[PDB]
Amino acid sequence: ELDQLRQEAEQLKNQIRDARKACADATLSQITNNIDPVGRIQMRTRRTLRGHLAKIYAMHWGTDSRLLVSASQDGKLIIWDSYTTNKVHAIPLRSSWVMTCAYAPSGNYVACGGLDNICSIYNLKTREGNVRVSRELAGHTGYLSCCRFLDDNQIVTSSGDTTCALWDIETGQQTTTFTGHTGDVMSLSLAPDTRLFVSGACDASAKLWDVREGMCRQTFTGHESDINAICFFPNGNAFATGSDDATCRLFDLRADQELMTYSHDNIICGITSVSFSKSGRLLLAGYDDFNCNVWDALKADRAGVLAGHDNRVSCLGVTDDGMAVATGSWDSFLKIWN
Amino acid sequence: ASIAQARKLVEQLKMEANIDRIKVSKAAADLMAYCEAHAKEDPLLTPVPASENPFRE
Amino acid sequence: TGIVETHFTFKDLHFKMFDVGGQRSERKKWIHCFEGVTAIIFCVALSDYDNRMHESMKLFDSICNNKWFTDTSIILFLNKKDLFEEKIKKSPLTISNTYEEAAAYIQCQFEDLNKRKDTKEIYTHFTCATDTKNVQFVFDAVTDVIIKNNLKDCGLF
Amino acid sequence: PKLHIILFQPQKNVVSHRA
Amino acid sequence: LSAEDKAAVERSKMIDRNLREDGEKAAREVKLLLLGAGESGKSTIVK
């Protein structure tokens, strides 16, 4: 009787919902009252980068907050020096279709991926003085949507099909596979402890994975559309998700609930990128209608707006030291704001 | 096929219910306190001195 | 695997050819990467008419109305006509029986599915198993598309 | 000639880029 | 700006010249997307 198993699953889900409702004690909108706000924010552009020629899909700050890596719809992966607008390296690619770029924390390697469903890892410091392709990783049925480094020898990938993977660089064969989703896995974010990582997919859910056990730990619902980007809170007990509902949400682990929602009548366009600054006071979201918004984390009202771009805002990333925020839109430019 | 998948889903959900949780108000208070404690080093909240800005000119 | 690509040169002209049909994922998530492609080449099976053709027509309808493809031109190739001529007798096109009538009816029921007639055009063709003039048709359509775009950009058209 | 088409023969006002 | 900056700007100029040449060359290629249904004779059309 398969219906019996379906009914049992429904009862277990009902139990979880009852426990979640009972765990609630108050609302952050009630506890975070009569507290000093940050105030209106005025920010102006500082740098402009002009190398590329087509749309730009991803970016990633370095570990010293000076170097950048940029991947476009051309065969070129450009490395920028932000302080003085110089080009340090120009990488010729083997496939013009790119959706994700990542900078190794040691600064010795770069990763690129896209519709080709194959992950290419590049070495930057070689005696011959030219960038030689280090390795190629195959075994994803679908495309790659996001990839991040753990060290010089491991890497994580999120695939178009319902899988995420852990790769050993030296021996291309995979090590562990995480399979619990029903749909496209569109973004991932690594925790600072690197013991856990959070993946967001197209079935209106987010999962919590521990790398060594290889099993899921928590499933979070509430969004009524597909989610597109995700990032951790600097403490490590929270993260933020953006979806096509034009509404960001902040989740916490221990309470296992949904804390705050950010939305207003003016915004209708979806979200393509979400990131947190240092000290966890400001949330940066990149909307489709050529605009970026800084959100009061602990209050409903909106902070100052950041609107200078000419097309859809593809990616945005905040530096490790908190100096600046970089924005790369579908026009060829990148803007560094401070 | 269907039986195996259903068994996997039921076991996954059964393992989920055994987690240990704490008060939501405590978590909200922790988030309120963490930001206030670390406001000194946050270059974007307030404008830093021009002598300390690597994006001066 | 993934996306398959091909090169060929004709009349001192470069042609990139992107096969994408093997992706097997959500089309709406990544379909926008191809905005700005000069032409869309569609293929319709005629011998698979008895309904597969309803699915093919629905798929065609979707591509025309996508927001990214508002101004892109469509080159349509109608294949499997050699078997179609014989299949009409066994299965009438109502599933004025003749080859010309059935071909005209099929062409009209597809070509009547673009609302913005002024914005884009639907080049149409009948292809057989063996024909050396297909590349000439692609060349003569692509040049016309290029000229129309250049004229529209400068305000002349 | 252009004025002739604009005023006297609005029916034949059209542009084509193939012929 | 001692010789380090001078070398950096010379290298940047070479990179920019190479990028401009490659982009100008690659703006001439004509890109064609392929679509259709399965088992519709796309292989024969490609061949």
Secondary structure, 3-state, chain A = CHHHHHHHHHHHHHHHHHHHHHHCCCCHHHHCCCCCCCCCCCCCEEEEECCCCCCEEEEEECCCCCEEEEEECCCEEEEEECCCCEEEEEEECCCCCCCEEEECCCCCEEEEECCCCCEEEEECCCCCCCCCEEEEECCCCCCEEEEEECCCCEEEEEECCCCEEEEECCCCCEEEEECCCCCCEEEEEECCCCCEEEEEECCCCEEEEECCCCCEEEEECCCCCCEEEEEECCCCCEEEEEECCCCEEEEECCCCCEEEEECCCCCCCCEEEEEECHHHCEEEEEECCCEEEEEECCCCCEEEEECCCCCCEEEEEECCCCCCEEEEECCCCEEEEC
- d(Cα A98, Cα B12) in Å, to the nearest integer? 35
- d(Cα A1, Cα A8) in Å, to the nearest integer? 11
Q: How many CA atoms within 13 Å lie on the side-chain side of A241?
A: 32
**B9 is in which domain, residue-wise?**
1-57
The answer to whether A51 contacts chain E (CB < 8 Å) is: yes
- At C124 the three-state DSSP class reads strand
The answer to whether A269 contacts chain C (CB < 8 Å) is: no
**Radius of gyration, alpha carbons of chain C:** 17
With beta carbons less than 8 A apart as the criterion, state whether A73 and A115 touch. Answer: no
Residue type, A23: C
Pairing verdict, β A109-113 and A119-123? antiparallel
- Locate C17 and state its tokens: 């050819």
With beta carbons less than 8 A apart as the criterion, state whether A177 and A165 touch. Answer: yes
Pairing verdict, β A133-137 and A206-210? unpaired
Contacts of A13 in chain B (CB under 8 A): 13
CA distances from C100 to A13, A192, C49, C56 (A): 61, 69, 16, 21
Contacts of D18 in chain C (CB under 8 A): 144
- d(Cα B45, Cα A54) in Å, to the nearest integer? 33
Q: Which residues contact C91 (CB under 8 A, 6 or more apart)?
A: C49, C50
- d(Cα A138, Cα A174) in Å, to the nearest integer? 9
Separation in Å, CA of E32 to nearest CA in chain C: 5
- Locate A170 and state its tokens: 């030296």
Domains in chain B, number: 1
Closest Cα in chain D to C156: D15
Separation in Å, CA of C147 to nearest CA in chain A: 22
Q: Which of C17, C44, C127 sits opposite E34 (nearest CB)?
A: C17
With beta carbons less than 8 A apart as the criterion, state whether E5 and C27 touch. Answer: no
Contacts of C26 in chain A (CB under 8 A): 160, 183-184, 202
- d(Cα E25, Cα E19) in Å, to the nearest integer? 10
Phi, psi of C30 (to 5 degrees): -115, 5
Domains in chain A, number: 1
Pairing verdict, β A144-149 and A154-159? antiparallel
Residue A316: burial class (beta carbons within 10 Å; 0-12, 13-18, 19+): buried
Element (H, E) at C88: helix C81-90
CA distances from B47 to A61, A323, A338, B50 (A): 22, 10, 9, 9
Which of C56, C97, C61 minimizes the C-alpha distance to C80?
C56
The packing angle between helices A2-23 and B2-16, to 10°, is 20
What is the torsional sign of CA A131, A134, A138, A144?
negative
- d(Cα A205, Cα A219) in Å, to the nearest integer? 7
Resolution of the experimental structure, in angstroms: 3.2
With beta carbons less than 8 A apart as the criterion, state whether A262 and A271 touch. Answer: no
CB under 8 A, 24+ apart: contacts of C29-34: C29/A160, C29/A184, C29/A186, C29/A202, C30/A99, C30/A115, C30/A143, C31/C66, C31/C68, C32/C68, C33/A73, C33/A97, C33/A99, C33/A115, C34/C68, C34/E33
CA distances from B31 to A23, A32, A237, A295, B22 (A): 17, 10, 9, 15, 14
What does DSSP assign to residue B52? G
Closest Cα in chain C to D18: C144
DSSP string, C33-65: GGTT-SEEEEEEESS----HHHHHHHHHHHHHH
**Residue holding tokens 């990214």?**
C68
The shares of helix, strand and coil residues in chain C, as percent rounded to the nearest 5, are 40, 20, 40
Enumerate neighbours of A (3 or more CB pairs within 8 A).
Answer: B, C, E
- Locate A4 and state its tokens: 């019996």
- Do the Cβ atoms of A143 and C26 come within 8 Å? no
Element (H, E) at E6: helix E3-26
Physical contact, A and D (3 or more Cβ pairs within 8 A) = no
Q: Edge-to-edge, what's the strand order for the sheet holding A282-287?
A: A271-276, A282-287, A291-296, A302-306
- Do the Cβ atoms of C41 and E38 come within 8 Å? no
Under 8 Å CB pairs connecting chains A and E tally to 22
CA distances from A68 to A47, A335, C147 (A): 13, 12, 40
For residue C80, say whether it is annotated as part of any ligand binding site: yes
**A65 is in which domain, residue-wise?**
2-337
Q: How many CA atoms within 13 Å lie on the side-chain side of C65?
A: 9
Which of A197, A275, A164 minimizes the C-alpha distance to A230?
A275
- d(Cα A228, Cα A273) in Å, to the nearest integer? 7
- Locate A67 and state its tokens: 């170097």
- d(Cα A230, Cα A190) in Å, to the nearest integer? 10
- At E35 the three-state DSSP class reads strand
With beta carbons less than 8 A apart as the criterion, state whether A87 and A78 touch. Answer: yes
The packing angle between helices C52-65 and C99-111, to 10°, is 40
**Residue holding tokens 């699953």?**
A9
- Locate B52 and state its tokens: 């300390």
The answer to whether A41 contacts chain E (CB < 8 Å) is: no
Cα C157 to the center of its chain, rounded Å: 25
What does DSSP assign to residue D19? -
- d(Cα A297, Cα A278) in Å, to the nearest integer? 12
Q: What is the dihedral of CA A94, A98, A100, A104, to 10 degrees?
A: 20
The answer to whether D15 contacts chain C (CB < 8 Å) is: yes
Q: What angle do CA A32, A36, A39 make, to 5 degrees?
A: 115
What is the torsional sign of CA A218, A224, A226, A229?
negative
**Residue holding tokens 């790398």?**
A211
- Locate A135 and state its tokens: 């390795």
The answer to whether B1 contacts chain A (CB < 8 Å) is: no
Contacts of D17 in chain C (CB under 8 A): 144, 147-148, 151, 157
Separation in Å, CA of E42 to nearest CA in chain C: 7
- Do the Cβ atoms of C33 and A115 come within 8 Å? yes
Separation in Å, CA of E9 to nearest CA in chain A: 7
With beta carbons less than 8 A apart as the criterion, state whether E36 and C42 touch. Answer: yes
Separation in Å, CA of C21 to nearest CA in chain A: 12
- Do the Cβ atoms of E23 and A53 come within 8 Å? yes
Element (H, E) at E32: strand E30-36
The answer to whether C17 contacts chain A (CB < 8 Å) is: no
For residue C82, say whether it is annotated as part of any ligand binding site: yes
Contacts of A161 in chain C (CB under 8 A): 25
For position A222, which CATH number holds? 2.130.10.10
- At C111 the three-state DSSP class reads helix
Residue type, C14: H
With beta carbons less than 8 A apart as the criterion, state whether A200 and A242 touch. Answer: no
- d(Cα C119, Cα C46) in Å, to the nearest integer? 28
Element (H, E) at E30: strand E30-36
**CB environment E10-20: b (16+ within 10 A), e (fewer):** eebeebeeebe
CB-CB neighbours of A232 under 10 Å: 19
Cα A155 to the center of its chain, rounded Å: 15
Which of A284, A279, A209 minimizes the C-alpha distance to A242?
A284
**Residue holding tokens 């929602």?**
A261
**Radius of gyration, alpha carbons of chain E:** 22
- d(Cα A77, Cα A111) in Å, to the nearest integer? 10
Question: Which residues does residue A196 pair with via DSSP β-bridges, in sequence order?
Answer: A210
- At C130 the three-state DSSP class reads coil
Closest Cα in chain C to E31: C16
CA distances from B19 to A208, A258, B26 (A): 13, 17, 18
CB under 8 A, 24+ apart: contacts of A219-223: A219/B16, A220/A251, A220/A256, A220/A258, A222/A249, A222/A258, A223/A247, A223/A249
Q: Which of E8, E18, E19 sits opposite A86 (nearest CB)?
A: E8
- Do the Cβ atoms of C25 and A202 come within 8 Å? no
**Strand runs labelled E in chain C:** 4-9, 14-19, 39-45, 73-79, 122-126
- d(Cα A76, Cα A96) in Å, to the nearest integer? 8
Separation in Å, CA of C22 to nearest CA in chain A: 10
- d(Cα B26, Cα B28) in Å, to the nearest integer? 5
Q: How many CA atoms within 13 Å lie on the side-chain side of A251?
A: 22
Question: Which residues does residue A188 pair with via DSSP β-bridges, in sequence order?
Answer: A199
Which of C1, C16, C32 would best serve as a mutation to test chain A binding (most A beta carbons within 10 A)?
C1
Question: Which residues does residue A79 pair with via DSSP β-bridges, in sequence order?
Answer: A69, A89
Q: How many CA atoms within 13 Å lie on the side-chain side of A27?
A: 7
For residue C22, say whether it is annotated as part of any ligand binding site: yes
Which of A11, A232, A281, A306 would best serve as a mutation to test chain B binding (most B beta carbons within 10 A)?
A281
Under 8 Å CB pairs connecting chains A and B tally to 121
Which of B44, B48, B53 would best serve as a mutation to test chain A binding (most A beta carbons within 10 A)?
B44
Separation in Å, CA of C27 to nearest CA in chain E: 12
- d(Cα A333, Cα A327) in Å, to the nearest integer? 9
- d(Cα A289, Cα A266) in Å, to the nearest integer? 11
Element (H, E) at E14: helix E3-26
- d(Cα A73, Cα A55) in Å, to the nearest integer? 6
The answer to whether C33 contacts chain A (CB < 8 Å) is: yes
- At C14 the three-state DSSP class reads strand
